[PDB]
Amino acid sequence: PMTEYKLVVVGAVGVGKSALTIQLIQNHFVDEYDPTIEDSYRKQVVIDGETCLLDILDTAGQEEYSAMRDQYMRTGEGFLCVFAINNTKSFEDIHQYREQIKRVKDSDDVPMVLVGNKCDLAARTVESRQAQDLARSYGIPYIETSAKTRQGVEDAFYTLVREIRQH
């Protein structure tokens, strides 16, 4: 009665990919910004009455990601594209990450979830209705999360698992 899902967290350099991951695992938000290279975490949860084993990957950005991005995109089965609502450069990169994933998977229907992190800060640079239209063109859900207040953090990861489970 065990089902194992492999999750991949991609995004810009500073959008809270590790903060969202640590908040789900440790239930603890880290204030200091430490760049992460490649970290894999495991956790067994219960989603809709089914015990699921989750393998989450913490990818990096910039040149370190540029070279070694094509390998883990072929291994993972669900991608949690994360952007921060406090910088627009990260939201503009979301298109580039999907094109690389779709080119690796050689398919136009890959389980993905658009996530606007850092939704606890005022003066957002990216309105919600913007990311709604983007996720609509991709055929994927859109959740606003905050790794500091774990707002919608459990809802985001569980939604990506449901996108895999129903795929």
Partner: protein, 64 residues
Amino acid sequence: SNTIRVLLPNHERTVVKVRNGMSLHDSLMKALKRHGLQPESSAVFRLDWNTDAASLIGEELQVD
């Protein structure tokens, strides 16, 4: 390369960067607490914590 990959229990793993003349314990101390593990209770499989970090470039080690 300045990159070193490390494996962890429960099918976890992490990749840490090292510098010239860095301690094994002092180079990955943040990654151990980030995954949730103390270096006192940790066990590298085998080597010593006083081993140079740059001296282990290109190899993979496990922790228990």
